[PDB]
Amino acid sequence: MKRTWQPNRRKRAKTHGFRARMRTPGGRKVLKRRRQKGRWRLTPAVRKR
Amino acid sequence: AVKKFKPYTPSRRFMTVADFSEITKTEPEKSLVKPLKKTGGRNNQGRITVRFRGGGHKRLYRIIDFKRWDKVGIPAKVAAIEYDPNRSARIALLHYVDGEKRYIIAPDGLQVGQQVVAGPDAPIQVGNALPLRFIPVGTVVHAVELEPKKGAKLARAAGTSAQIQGREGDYVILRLPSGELRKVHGECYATVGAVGNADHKNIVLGKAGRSRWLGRRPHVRGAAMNPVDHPHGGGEGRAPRGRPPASPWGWQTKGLKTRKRRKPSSRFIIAR
Amino acid sequence: XGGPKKKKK
RNA sequence: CGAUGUCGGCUCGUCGCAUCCUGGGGCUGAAGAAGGUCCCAAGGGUUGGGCUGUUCGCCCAUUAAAGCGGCACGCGAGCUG
RNA sequence: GAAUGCCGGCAUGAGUAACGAUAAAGAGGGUGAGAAUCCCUCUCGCCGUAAGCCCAAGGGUUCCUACGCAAUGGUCGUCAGCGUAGGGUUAGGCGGGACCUAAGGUGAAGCCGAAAGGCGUAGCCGAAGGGCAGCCGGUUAAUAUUCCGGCCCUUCCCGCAGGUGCGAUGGGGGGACGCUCUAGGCUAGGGGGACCGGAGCCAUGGACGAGCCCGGCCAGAAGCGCAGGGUGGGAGGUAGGCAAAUCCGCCUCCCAACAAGCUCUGCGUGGUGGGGAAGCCCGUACGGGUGACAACCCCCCGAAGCCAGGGAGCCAAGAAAAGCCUCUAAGCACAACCUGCGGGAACCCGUACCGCAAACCGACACAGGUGGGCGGGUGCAAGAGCACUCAGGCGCGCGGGAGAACCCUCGCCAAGGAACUCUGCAAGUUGGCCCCGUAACUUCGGGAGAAGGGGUGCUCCCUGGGGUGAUGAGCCCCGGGGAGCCGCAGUGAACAGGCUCUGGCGACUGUUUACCAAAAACACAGCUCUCUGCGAACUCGUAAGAGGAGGUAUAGGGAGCGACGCUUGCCCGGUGCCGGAAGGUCAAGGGGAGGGGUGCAAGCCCCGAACCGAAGCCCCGGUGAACGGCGGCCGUAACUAUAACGGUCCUAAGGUAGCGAAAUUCCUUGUCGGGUAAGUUCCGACCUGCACGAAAAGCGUAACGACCGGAGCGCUGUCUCGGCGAGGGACCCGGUGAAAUUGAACUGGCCGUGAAGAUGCGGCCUACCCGUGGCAGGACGAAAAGACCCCGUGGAGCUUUACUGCAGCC
RNA sequence: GAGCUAGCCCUGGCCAGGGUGAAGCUGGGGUGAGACCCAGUGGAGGCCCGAACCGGUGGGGGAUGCAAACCCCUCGGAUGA
RNA sequence: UGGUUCGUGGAGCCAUGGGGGAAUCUGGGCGGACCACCGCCUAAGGCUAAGUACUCCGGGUGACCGAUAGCGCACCAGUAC
RNA sequence: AAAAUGUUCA
RNA sequence: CGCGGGGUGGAGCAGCCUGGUAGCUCGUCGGGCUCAUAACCCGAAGGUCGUCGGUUCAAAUCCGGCCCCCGCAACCA
RNA sequence: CCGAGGGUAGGGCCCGUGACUGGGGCGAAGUCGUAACAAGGUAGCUGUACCGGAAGGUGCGGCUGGA
Ligand SMILES: NC[C@@H]1O[C@H](O[C@H]2[C@@H](O)[C@H](O[C@@H]3[C@@H](O)[C@H](N)C[C@H](N)[C@H]3O[C@H]3O[C@H](CO)[C@@H](O)[C@H](O)[C@H]3N)O[C@@H]2CO)[C@H](N)[C@@H](O)[C@@H]1O
Ligand SMILES: [Mg+2]
Ligand SMILES: [Mg+2]
Ligand SMILES: [Mg+2]
Ligand SMILES: [Mg+2]
Ligand SMILES: [Mg+2]
Ligand SMILES: [Mg+2]
Ligand SMILES: [Mg+2]
Ligand SMILES: [Mg+2]
Ligand SMILES: [Mg+2]
Ligand SMILES: [Mg+2]
Ligand SMILES: [Mg+2]
Ligand SMILES: [Mg+2]
Ligand SMILES: [Mg+2]
Ligand SMILES: [Mg+2]
Ligand SMILES: [Mg+2]
Ligand SMILES: [Mg+2]
Ligand SMILES: [Mg+2]
Ligand SMILES: [Mg+2]
Ligand SMILES: [Mg+2]
Ligand SMILES: [Mg+2]
Ligand SMILES: [Mg+2]
Ligand SMILES: [Mg+2]
Ligand SMILES: [Mg+2]
Ligand SMILES: [Mg+2]
Ligand SMILES: [Mg+2]
Ligand SMILES: [Mg+2]
Ligand SMILES: [Mg+2]
Ligand SMILES: [Mg+2]
Ligand SMILES: [Mg+2]
Ligand SMILES: [Mg+2]
Ligand SMILES: [Mg+2]
Ligand SMILES: [Mg+2]
Ligand SMILES: [Mg+2]
Ligand SMILES: [Mg+2]
Ligand SMILES: [Mg+2]
Ligand SMILES: [Mg+2]
Ligand SMILES: [Mg+2]
Ligand SMILES: [Mg+2]
Ligand SMILES: [Mg+2]
Ligand SMILES: [Mg+2]
Ligand SMILES: [Mg+2]
Ligand SMILES: [Mg+2]
Ligand SMILES: [Mg+2]
Ligand SMILES: [Mg+2]
Ligand SMILES: [Mg+2]
Ligand SMILES: [Mg+2]
Ligand SMILES: [Mg+2]
Ligand SMILES: [Mg+2]
Ligand SMILES: [Mg+2]
Ligand SMILES: [Mg+2]
Ligand SMILES: [Mg+2]
Ligand SMILES: [Mg+2]
Ligand SMILES: [Mg+2]
Ligand SMILES: [Mg+2]
Ligand SMILES: [Mg+2]
Ligand SMILES: [Mg+2]
Ligand SMILES: [Mg+2]
Ligand SMILES: [Mg+2]
Ligand SMILES: [Mg+2]
Ligand SMILES: [Mg+2]
Ligand SMILES: [Mg+2]
Ligand SMILES: [Mg+2]
Ligand SMILES: [Mg+2]
Ligand SMILES: [Mg+2]
Ligand SMILES: [Mg+2]
Ligand SMILES: [Mg+2]
Ligand SMILES: [Mg+2]
Ligand SMILES: [Mg+2]
Ligand SMILES: [Mg+2]
Ligand SMILES: [Mg+2]
Ligand SMILES: [Mg+2]
Ligand SMILES: [Mg+2]
Ligand SMILES: [Mg+2]
Ligand SMILES: [Mg+2]
Ligand SMILES: [Mg+2]
Ligand SMILES: [Mg+2]
Ligand SMILES: [Mg+2]
Ligand SMILES: [Mg+2]
Ligand SMILES: [Mg+2]
Ligand SMILES: [Mg+2]
Ligand SMILES: [Mg+2]
Ligand SMILES: [Mg+2]
Ligand SMILES: [Mg+2]
Ligand SMILES: [Mg+2]
Ligand SMILES: [Mg+2]
Ligand SMILES: [Mg+2]
Ligand SMILES: [Mg+2]
Ligand SMILES: [Mg+2]
Ligand SMILES: [Mg+2]
Ligand SMILES: [Mg+2]
Ligand SMILES: [Mg+2]
Ligand SMILES: [Mg+2]
Ligand SMILES: [Mg+2]
Ligand SMILES: [Mg+2]
Ligand SMILES: [Mg+2]
Ligand SMILES: [Mg+2]
Ligand SMILES: [Mg+2]
Ligand SMILES: [Mg+2]
Ligand SMILES: [Mg+2]
Ligand SMILES: [Mg+2]
Ligand SMILES: [Mg+2]
Ligand SMILES: [Mg+2]
Ligand SMILES: [Mg+2]
Ligand SMILES: [Mg+2]
Ligand SMILES: [Mg+2]
Ligand SMILES: [Mg+2]
Ligand SMILES: [Mg+2]
Ligand SMILES: [Mg+2]
Ligand SMILES: [Mg+2]
Ligand SMILES: [Mg+2]
Ligand SMILES: [Mg+2]
Ligand SMILES: [Mg+2]
Ligand SMILES: [Mg+2]
Ligand SMILES: [Mg+2]
Ligand SMILES: [Mg+2]
Ligand SMILES: [Mg+2]
Ligand SMILES: [Mg+2]
Ligand SMILES: [Mg+2]
Ligand SMILES: [Mg+2]
Ligand SMILES: [Mg+2]
Ligand SMILES: [Mg+2]
Ligand SMILES: [Mg+2]
Ligand SMILES: [Mg+2]
Ligand SMILES: [Mg+2]
Ligand SMILES: [Mg+2]
Ligand SMILES: [Mg+2]
Ligand SMILES: [Mg+2]
Ligand SMILES: [Mg+2]
Ligand SMILES: [Mg+2]
Ligand SMILES: [Mg+2]
């Protein structure tokens, strides 16, 4: 059947990107938490040009 | 007149379509004056706030003239009468000698080629606009302003009118389509005649689809729902209500008057 | 799995 | 009750006798034939349909007879539902 | 030593199930330490509106190549999509960006919000939509509309040459649009060819023949030619297009009304450029050479594609912005703009490869999912259907034997045809087209494919229409008539309704419980009630704000009923809602009679009665397509029987029409009648309606239905009642190799006993040790800390005249 | 967190081939004029058959499956909600 | 209404949203309703080290762990997944 | 303003 | 089985809970009006209060057990 | 070839019959009420509509077969 993962580079970027997270206090805290944690990747890596 | 069909299909046996014979050879509209992009959307910034809206034909807005006092004294020739997707009435395309082209909402009896004009001057004829005062008591009228210089707001639906009843210092009394008795300021413009396309009420949609074409989504009964959804939801195999009939939001829907009492508008109203 | 089936039979 | 799947049908059976038939017998208000009743006897047999989820039962056509129960109201790690 | 404990390790079932589509393999020769599995050749099978090509998304080195097999591959593995290394992605013209705007996002001004923040015209951002200039070949092992060859374009910038008042983010025009059906002419694509060109080929009985086989194009500026799209030209007046316009718009006179003329596309032709089969010869993992000086022509079918902004009809009435044309304003007219010609300048990112899949989404080389374009030929009426087959791509990454049960999938059957069964479930019958021929009923459309039938191949003869051709040959479409041939059989294979009668419910097409319910549930047009005068009611938000609606009583919100036909009765006492400037009650507040505490006192400070005090409640009316409700007991007619008729109690009033053993009927298989040999079902009736009933609508209704019930005909393996056969498994051999479960085991029957159902206790009986194929009675078998039930002063969802609050409203 | 799913918005795409034959046109007929009736044309429809496509009716298989919803036969719609 | 031990309590004081609304030393707040007396203070403007809290970081010590422990990580770990 | 009825055959 | 409501003149109903008093309508009977019947008018009769018990000074009335009658309930399996 | 006829399928007309149902006719002295004929005690009749145990009542218009 159709599963739940339907990859889209634009969606992933607009949805979970560094700039989206930065836009709101909710998201800014996510970066803070991930930084303090020592996460190698703050936001998902969306590729291609 | 109303177009009628033979039952060559079920739902074609009741279906019924407007007569478009008053639609003069001018079916597609007029750029310049209108159209605008019209912005379909069944809801506010976010959430739906009027249920069951959506779908249905794309539209172009015809930006019509609801304040006729710009062109006081300037007459215009009625050039055409065309279909307007965004109202029950039809619209008149008129050419002002000025050059300017406006649409007026098209009254019953309006003929193409006719002369029409607005102002204190203005022969009392079908199509003309006047401040309410100079209009003879008892004449039927439409596109009436509520307060002066604020635009036509009463009687624009197809086949509607108001009748002038009498006067009272600065106000003339109106009898509105609903039957209400209203004091409306003398200085309010209103155009003589009834609205026309009066056979609009006689049309039978005929099937579900037609409803959808006009963007009317299926309306579901409270009875059909559940207690979470509606006061009428549940219980077992059908149910008669079990309380005084209500809206989904709990207010009673048979009888409960809802106009606020202390409206300052009150001292200008005399009926139902 | 996670069910979600209701106890039928 | 940290689970013994609960009706009926199909399937496969087997067991008890307080026997429906067939075998043998006493009494009969047993002439004969055919019955009635009780004793002995289970080796074997005990149909096919209409109705109903039905068990049961009522019917149709037969038959030597159309037996009654137990086996987790036998049998769902066999089937049906 | 235990916690269905936690982490780890190793057992058990077990060499057991399985090895992922039943599209299929056989052989020869290589290579190698080692080949069913890798390379090659031959033979066979499968896909071919794909299982073949080209994109988009996504994936991110999987691409090519060299060297390799520990692991990954469900077996092998010399192979690989795997390992190591190296190589590979070339753009002014393709796409995206130095262009545009849509939803929406953001957002200066501004508005709002305890803070975080929320809204918000302008502007900006935002794209398979608008705009925009490359076509055809050739090369690499791997890239090419990118490199190369030919042919052809686009911008800027600087020049000369000449034209003109040039000139804005501003005005106007254009861009610019729906659905259905469509005309004319073309192209793509395809068929045929006695004509042109080709290596070859006479097999096995016959054929040297207009024989077989293969192929007969592509691109192409200017100029033509042919289709077709756009568009009136003047002169005056002008108050509108938010400044100004010569522009546009609106008037008024001329000439056109035509595509005549201007332009704009498409297609042919075109200077020239390129391609160029079968077969044979070679060495590939494949490509090359020759066939060639290759030929490169004539008909026919023909689009859903092009000319495109074509035409017609219809209602539901069908984006914007920029490029582009034009008008002018500030400025400036030694600027500037336009035309032509030259030289110069032309960036950034993407380009490999998979791409209906072993490279994407599903933990997997997963029988699933995944958007657009091309998708050839023949025949079957057509077609993207179906059968085979081009090109192209595959035989699905375990095999070899055997020929048991049993299972799956499939074929056939004597005689009977539903006796099977909850039910004809399943399976069969029927089946395409052409032509006869069709009932009740009906809203006049339908019911209709009703039903029931006949025709269907091939040969020859005669003959009627077109179409393309000139009025003809041919080539291509429809027909008609008549003789005849063969077979069991002519839509000879494949794709292709079983039918009818009669009830229930719902009008109908539709929608619904992704993952057990597709229905009589929801929806639906339509009917009615009610709210709402517009800063509408209603809804979301604290607010601002927004929807409603750029709508205005023929409108919008809420409720019920649910096409249509005939209809929808009585009760306003209770509850709700509506209407009542009276009266009763009523909170803060006003008012202070009067009383209290302190003070030597003026004073300061407490209470506090009359009375004045809203809504709400009470009270008075209204209102049922508002919440709802709509009786009991006796008596009576000249056979009995029954009761039109009477009495009486009670109610706010005492269910009318229509229907009725019903989706409602308990007693019940009510009682009659029908169908049947027989009928708890079914249909028609009676009415004693436990416990129908009129918008939670009543009774009907043509048509409609993957809905539910009854019956019949046809037809059958459903059954009597089974049998035989096919293949995929099962079984044997080689290879790889799990699982849930498991206190330990050396694990028999009976009759008992025991916590009441014993392999394990007692008595007796039986039984050498160990497997394999099977069957499921048992181990109270496995799997899930029973869903039922009860318990816990456990938890949630829902309800209301439970309590207490809050929003909202008054 | 709406890359699954529900709805709505903006912008694109898709729906082989067959049937049936409404209005309306044109001619004829009829009438004082009509209504209306016959053809012929026309091509309407939540119209019909049926691929793609969207579904999920019934049965069988599957049940440590190919698959945490699959497969086979059959079936609903397929110019419209 | 909040704060204080103070839950309206005899409820002060200290803050405050609403209404009314003074005074400048003979002026004003407080000592738990209120009044008197006796006393303490001088509101409606602001700044002010130290003593106190903490441990990302550096150092010392340990009747602290010794690779299922000790931080999640002694090992290229907030990694692989 | 109100007032019902009169068995069969002659 | 369980529950709670009721038996009162000939008929249909009050009367009970706060014990001492049985009443209403119709019917029946006698009398009138009418030619006659009904209607109508004036008079009158008629109730072991289902029974068995006792509670009391006194029971239709209050309390127990049966007897019929009416209605409600019988759920989860 | 046609063809008597037989078979299969589907319609039309007529006859008979059927639980039950509808009204009707008739049958000396059963029931309920008083509609009509006198002004029938509401003038009657009437077409139609609604309603009622029954005659009938009433709404609307009409008639003289009444004043
Ligand atoms: N035959 C006349 C028609 O039928 C009905 O008439 C029938 C009945 O109404 C009528 O019944 C009458 C009754 O009216 C009158 N008041 C009393 C009388 N005894 C009855 O009589 C009836 O029943 C008796 C039995 O008892 C029979 O013997 C007698 O023949 C019969 N007529 O008897 C008639 C039968 O013959 C209509 N009422 C009448 O208008 C109509 O025209
Ligand atoms: Mg525009
Ligand atoms: Mg919102
Ligand atoms: Mg937002
Ligand atoms: Mg609805
Ligand atoms: Mg529901
Ligand atoms: Mg609710
Ligand atoms: Mg119910
Ligand atoms: Mg309810
Ligand atoms: Mg238990
Ligand atoms: Mg257990
Ligand atoms: Mg015996
Ligand atoms: Mg004997
Ligand atoms: Mg039968
Ligand atoms: Mg049966
Ligand atoms: Mg039993
Ligand atoms: Mg037995
Ligand atoms: Mg038992
Ligand atoms: Mg049992
Ligand atoms: Mg089972
Ligand atoms: Mg078991
Ligand atoms: Mg069941
Ligand atoms: Mg222990
Ligand atoms: Mg376990
Ligand atoms: Mg373990
Ligand atoms: Mg085993
Ligand atoms: Mg085995
Ligand atoms: Mg095996
Ligand atoms: Mg395989
Ligand atoms: Mg080797
Ligand atoms: Mg094939
Ligand atoms: Mg790699
Ligand atoms: Mg490779
Ligand atoms: Mg291997
Ligand atoms: Mg594998
Ligand atoms: Mg190699
Ligand atoms: Mg590699
Ligand atoms: Mg481009
Ligand atoms: Mg740059
Ligand atoms: Mg932009
Ligand atoms: Mg915008
Ligand atoms: Mg914003
Ligand atoms: Mg941009
Ligand atoms: Mg574009
Ligand atoms: Mg200029
Ligand atoms: Mg513009
Ligand atoms: Mg030869
Ligand atoms: Mg060319
Ligand atoms: Mg101007
Ligand atoms: Mg060549
Ligand atoms: Mg057009
Ligand atoms: Mg712009
Ligand atoms: Mg411009
Ligand atoms: Mg490339
Ligand atoms: Mg490529
Ligand atoms: Mg390639
Ligand atoms: Mg594709
Ligand atoms: Mg594979
Ligand atoms: Mg796959
Ligand atoms: Mg697809
Ligand atoms: Mg094709
Ligand atoms: Mg065909
Ligand atoms: Mg096919
Ligand atoms: Mg047979
Ligand atoms: Mg046979
Ligand atoms: Mg038969
Ligand atoms: Mg049977
Ligand atoms: Mg049977
Ligand atoms: Mg049946
Ligand atoms: Mg079937
Ligand atoms: Mg049926
Ligand atoms: Mg039916
Ligand atoms: Mg339906
Ligand atoms: Mg349907
Ligand atoms: Mg479901
Ligand atoms: Mg289903
Ligand atoms: Mg369905
Ligand atoms: Mg608004
Ligand atoms: Mg709006
Ligand atoms: Mg409404
Ligand atoms: Mg309903
Ligand atoms: Mg309904
Ligand atoms: Mg209904
Ligand atoms: Mg009332
Ligand atoms: Mg009421
Ligand atoms: Mg009321
Ligand atoms: Mg009120
Ligand atoms: Mg009041
Ligand atoms: Mg009603
Ligand atoms: Mg009945
Ligand atoms: Mg019932
Ligand atoms: Mg019967
Ligand atoms: Mg019978
Ligand atoms: Mg009902
Ligand atoms: Mg109702
Ligand atoms: Mg069989
Ligand atoms: Mg086999
Ligand atoms: Mg093996
Ligand atoms: Mg042993
Ligand atoms: Mg035992
Ligand atoms: Mg022992
Ligand atoms: Mg023992
Ligand atoms: Mg067993
Ligand atoms: Mg168990
Ligand atoms: Mg438990
Ligand atoms: Mg408790
Ligand atoms: Mg708790
Ligand atoms: Mg026609
Ligand atoms: Mg059509
Ligand atoms: Mg359709
Ligand atoms: Mg179809
Ligand atoms: Mg669905
Ligand atoms: Mg406090
Ligand atoms: Mg104070
Ligand atoms: Mg103090
Ligand atoms: Mg003190
Ligand atoms: Mg102090
Ligand atoms: Mg230690
Ligand atoms: Mg260690
Ligand atoms: Mg550790
Ligand atoms: Mg750790
Ligand atoms: Mg009488
Ligand atoms: Mg008489
Ligand atoms: Mg006589
Ligand atoms: Mg239960
Ligand atoms: Mg008959
Ligand atoms: Mg009379
Ligand atoms: Mg009279
Ligand atoms: Mg009368
Ligand atoms: Mg009358
Ligand atoms: Mg009446």
Swiss-Prot record, chain A:
GO terms for molecular function: structural constituent of ribosome. GO terms for cellular component: ribonucleoprotein complex; ribosome. Residues 29-49 have a biased composition (Basic residues). Residues 26-49 are annotated as: Disordered. Keywords: Ribonucleoprotein, Ribosomal protein. One of its GO terms (biological process) is translation. InterPro entries: Ribosomal_bL34, Ribosomal_bL34_CS. Gene3D superfamilies: 1.10.287.3980. The keyword Metal-binding does not apply. Part of the 50S ribosomal subunit. The open reading frame (ORF) for this protein is entirely within the ORF for the RNase P protein (RnaP). The two start codons are separated by four nucleotides. Found on the solvent side of the large subunit. Belongs to the bacterial ribosomal protein bL34 family. This is Large ribosomal subunit protein bL34. The lineage of its organism: Bacteria, Thermotogati, Deinococcota, Deinococci, Thermales.
UniProtKB/Swiss-Prot annotation, chain B:
Disulfide bonds: none annotated. Keywords: Ribonucleoprotein, Ribosomal protein, RNA-binding, rRNA-binding. Residues 222-272 are annotated as: Disordered. It comes from Thermus thermophilus (strain ATCC 27634 / DSM 579 / HB8). One of its GO terms (biological process) is cytoplasmic translation. It comes from the Bacteria. This is Large ribosomal subunit protein uL2. Residues 256-272 have a biased composition (Basic residues). PROSITE patterns: RIBOSOMAL_L2. One of the primary rRNA binding proteins. Required for association of the 30S and 50S subunits to form the 70S ribosome, for tRNA binding and peptide bond formation. It has been suggested to have peptidyltransferase activity; this is somewhat controversial. Makes several contacts with the 16S rRNA (forming bridge B7b) in the 70S ribosome. The keyword RNA-binding applies. Part of the 50S ribosomal subunit. Forms a bridge to the 30S subunit in the 70S ribosome, contacting the 16S rRNA. May also make transient contacts with protein S6 during translation in the 70S ribosome. The gene is rplB.
